[PDB]
Design an enzyme around this catalytic site. Structure first.
Site: not given
Ligand code: BGC
Ligand code: 3DO
Ligand SMILES: *[C@@H]1O[C@H](CO)[C@@H](O[C@@H]2O[C@H](CO)[C@@H](O[C@@H]3O[C@H](CO[C@H]4O[C@H](CO)[C@@H](O)[C@H](O)[C@@H]4O[C@@H]4O[C@H](CO)[C@@H](O)[C@H](O)[C@H]4NC(C)=O)[C@@H](O)[C@H](O)[C@@H]3O)[C@H](O)[C@H]2NC(C)=O)[C@H](O[C@H]2O[C@@H](C)[C@@H](O)[C@@H](O)[C@@H]2O)[C@H]1NC(C)=O
Ligand SMILES: *[C@@H]1O[C@H](CO)[C@@H](O[C@@H]2O[C@H](CO)[C@@H](O[C@@H]3O[C@H](CO)[C@@H](O)[C@H](O)[C@@H]3O[C@@H]3OC[C@@H](O)[C@H](O)[C@H]3O)[C@H](O)[C@H]2NC(C)=O)[C@H](O[C@H]2O[C@@H](C)[C@@H](O)[C@@H](O)[C@@H]2O)[C@H]1NC(C)=O
Ligand SMILES: *[C@@H]1O[C@H](CO)[C@@H](O[C@@H]2O[C@H](CO)[C@@H](O[C@@H]3O[C@H](CO)[C@@H](O)[C@H](O)[C@@H]3O)[C@H](O)[C@H]2NC(C)=O)[C@H](O)[C@H]1NC(C)=O
Length: 602
Positions: A285, A491
């Site tokens: 990840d 998230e």
């Molecule tokens: O954007 C790339 C990745 O970011 C991560 O923070 C998320 O946990 C993933 O689900 C995602 O695929």
């Molecule tokens: O999932 C965590 C996300 O963090 C953001 O700051 C970025 O664009 C990438 C990623 O998709």
């Protein structure tokens, strides 16, 4: 002489071995490196032999970029990679998790929780099919989906990314995989990667494993459960994913009994690779290896050693590729990481690339651009939105006339609430921006617009975002549709211990329903405290995060189709009950998993 790996007529395994045998250490480590488009340039990609790029959430070439703009961006990167000594094409990944959702004008499908409510795996397969086309419309070859988390606590900010608290439902929805990738052949060996060709994309089962089992639903936290529980709840859908030829697996930020998944050799190598016979590639990840340590990134040398020895094949760095490549090169030169480990990682990455046809079609197809936001895909999203809706109430007493379905012909009707005319709110997180956003962020139809498109021409439609009680009582309305709920989140920003919707929401419902019969549409990523909303409302619909096609909502409100959705999660009476899942000993739900009222089409 003849170069076997460049010969499209040769078996994948032969092409893999032939190419691997030619590669330098720098070329091998480069394949294992995935970087953000934000740090990529032609020289960087060529000089570091980079294997993959991604867009993180909201990482786009321009606000409002066309499909062709995306194609030109991806092809620019590809041209740099193809200009290396060996000309190994890069694979470009993106979170296309409810449609090609970072892209302006892409069809936005309901989030996973609503798809779970449909109990319709074939619908989800067709969504995978449409999503692959819209991703390929933008030149991208790899989608970070499906999330096959089994969310066991709706306090988790990613609960909407899980189809259900019931692993059986999650297992059924693994049909997304052959939708995105194509159906596997009759001969197919479980665990092998598969992508049908240039009109399909590589998929990614994520996040391995137990991401939905963390204490109090704390995102990225500790999943405390014995092996029997892990294997019975959190693991099964990974086996279905193997059976369906999922090309990649992404590792979870979470820990299992205090062991970081990104450092867990027993599970990544012992189980996923050696027991499930997974032959695709395993990807970290985003800064996942950094987060092995506390503080994150405080011992990056350890992060690289732990993760690569655990069995990870590709690292989503995604920014500091110089440090990653330098450290990994040092570990190999020092014998801390064996060549066998590097060769395994590269074998798997190349296996996926050759299998999917990337060496034959490394560049975008301009003819695919028009797949983006295609009306047929919107019609599908509209069907999915309608099927995802769960009717929780349809009349205040057993004596009352059912409110739904509503008549399309009425002198005057009211549409109200913070979520009635807010496209960003109805799409939720992972839409245009990482965290989602408010207002008209893409092409779509809000609930208000859907109402205006549905009703008889003689029906006067009034919109008021937050009307007071007097406005409603004096308005001469036949009925009201009132939409309220959660704001977009993704998230950790979505972790929530109280699960009460923001105000004004309840106050609007109370003012409206106090004045006229009222259908409340609740937009949320999860069950939320709902008794007060129920008490006020004649009818109440859990619409989850239905996406860009708001007509799916009105298709059911006005009786074009009957309600059929059933709760894919337990609806709790109180957050103090949590966690509380179907099959628990203390099971005292407001609405059990599987509950849903029905109506019939008019
Ligand atoms: O954007 C790339 C990745 O970011 C991560 O923070 C998320 O946990 C993933 O689900 C995602 O695929
Ligand atoms: O999932 C965590 C996300 O963090 C953001 O700051 C970025 O664009 C990438 C990623 O998709
Ligand atoms: C239950 O627990 C949750 C999660 O912990 C909590 O919700 C969070 O509350 C945080 C503290 O208030 C809040 O953090 C702040 O956010 C400020 C800006 O927040 C707005 O914009 C973000 C997106 O950028 C949205 O996610 C927010 O919901 C909020 O959106 C605005 O909300 C109002 C009110 O409905 C609305 O009129 C606006 O239109 C709308 N704007 C937009 C653009 O949509 C920021 O400036 C601060 O620096 C700080 O970071 C956090 O965002 C929020 N998380 C969510 C909603 O996911 C609940 O507590 C609060 O709810 C919020 C909405 C607010 O009304 C507070 O007064 C509540 O206390 C908790 N509920 C409880 C304790 O009852
Ligand atoms: C008035 O609404 C009723 C309630 O929805 C409806 O009765 C339901 O009809 C559906 C669709 O035919 C039935 O679903 C099926 O159930 C089977 C038995 O388990 C399954 O094997 C099927 O796969 C299907 O299940 C659905 O599959 C898709 C998935 O997404 C759904 O979640 C899943 O349910 C359901 O059992 C009926 N429920 C009840 C209580 O009867 C009425 O439809 C009628 O139409 C006729 C032609 C026939 O289909 C009858 O079953 C049914 O009475 C509907 N009445 C009218 C006139 O339209
Ligand atoms: C699960 O989540 C909990 C809650 O966030 C995590 O515990 C927390 O861990 C952080 C460190 O990452 C602690 O913060 C630190 O506090 C000290 C002061 O005591 C300070 O010196 C540091 O700079 C840092 O800020 C935090 O106190 C701690 N919170 C609690 C309630 O224990 C936990 O690590 C997570 N577990 C997993 C496996 O991810």
């Amino acid at each position: 002489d003849y170069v076997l790996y460049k010969d499209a007529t040769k078996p994948v395994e032969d092409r893999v071995a032939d190419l691997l045998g030619r590669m330098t250490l720098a070329e091998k480590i480069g394949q294992m490196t995935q970087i953000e488009r934000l740090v990529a340039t032609p020289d960087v990609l060529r000089d570091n032999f980079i294997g993959s790029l991604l867009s993180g959430g909201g990482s786009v070439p321009r606000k409002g970029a066309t499909a062709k703009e995306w194609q030109d961006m991806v092809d620019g990167f590809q041209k740099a990679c193809m200009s290396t000594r060996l000309g190994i094409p890069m694979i470009y990944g993106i979170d296309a998790v409810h449609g090609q959702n970072n892209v302006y004008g892409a069809t936005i499908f309901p989030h996973n929780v609503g798809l779970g409510a449909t109990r319709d795996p074939y619908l989800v397969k067709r969504i995978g099919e449409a999503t692959a086309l819209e991703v390929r419309a933008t030149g991208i070859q790899y989608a970070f989906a499906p999330c096959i988390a089994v969310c066991r606590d709706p306090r988790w900010g990613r609960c909407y990314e899980s189809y259900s608290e019931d692993r059986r439902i999650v297992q059924s929805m693994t049909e997304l995989i052959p939708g995105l990738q194509g159906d596997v052949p009759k001969d197919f060996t479980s665990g092998m990667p598969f992508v049908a060709g240039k009109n399909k994309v590589a998929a990614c089962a994520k996040h391995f494993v137990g991401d939905g089992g963390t204490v109090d639903g704390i995102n990225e936290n500790n999943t405390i459960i014995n092996r029997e529980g892990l294997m019975n709840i959190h693991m099964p859908a990974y086996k279905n994913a193997m059976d369906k030829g999922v090309s990649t697996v992404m590792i979870s930020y979470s820990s299992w009994n205090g062991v970081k998944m990104h450092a867990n050799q027993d599970l990544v190598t012992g189980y996923l690779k050696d027991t499930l016979k997974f032959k695709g590639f395993v990807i970290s990840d985003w800064e996942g290896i950094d987060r092995i340590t506390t503080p994150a990134g405080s011992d990056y040398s350890y992060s690289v050693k732990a993760s690569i020895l655990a069995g990870l094949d590709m690292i989503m760095v995604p920014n500091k590729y110089q440090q990653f490549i330098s450290i990994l090169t040092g570990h190999v030169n020092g014998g801390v990481i064996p060549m066998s480990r590097i060769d395994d990682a590269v074998t798997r990455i190349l296996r996926v690339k050759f299998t999917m046809g990337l060496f034959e079609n490394p560049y975008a197809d301009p003819a695919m651009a028009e797949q983006l936001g295609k009306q047929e895909h919107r019609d599908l999203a509209r069907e999915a939105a309608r099927k995802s809706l769960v009717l929780l109430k349809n009349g205040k007493t057993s004596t009352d006339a059912p409110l739904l379905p509503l008549p399309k012909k009425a002198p005057k009707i009211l549409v109200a609430g913070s979520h009635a005319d807010n496209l960003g709110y109805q799409c939720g997180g992972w839409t245009i921006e990482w965290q989602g956003d408010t207002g008209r962020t893409t092409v779509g139809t809000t609930i208000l617009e859907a109402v205006k498109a549905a009703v008889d021409p003689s029906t006067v439609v009034v919109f008021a975002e937050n009307p007071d009680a007097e406005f409603v009582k004096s308005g001469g309305f036949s009925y009201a549709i009132v939409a309220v709920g959660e704001h977009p989140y993704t998230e950790t920003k979505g972790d929530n211990l109280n699960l009460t919707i923001p105000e004004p929401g309840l106050s609007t419902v109370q003012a409206v329903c106090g004045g006229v019969r009222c259908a409340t549409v609740l937009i949320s990523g999860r069950p939320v405290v709902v008794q007060p909303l129920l008490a006020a409302s004649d009818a109440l619909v859990a619409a989850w995060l239905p996406g860009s096609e708001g007509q799916g909502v009105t298709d059911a409100l006005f009786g074009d189709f009957g309600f059929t959705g059933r709760l894919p999660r337990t609806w709790f009476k109180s957050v103090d009950q949590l966690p509380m899942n179907v099959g628990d000993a203390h099971y005292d739900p407001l609405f059990r998993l599987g509950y849903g009222l029905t109506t019939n089409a008019t």
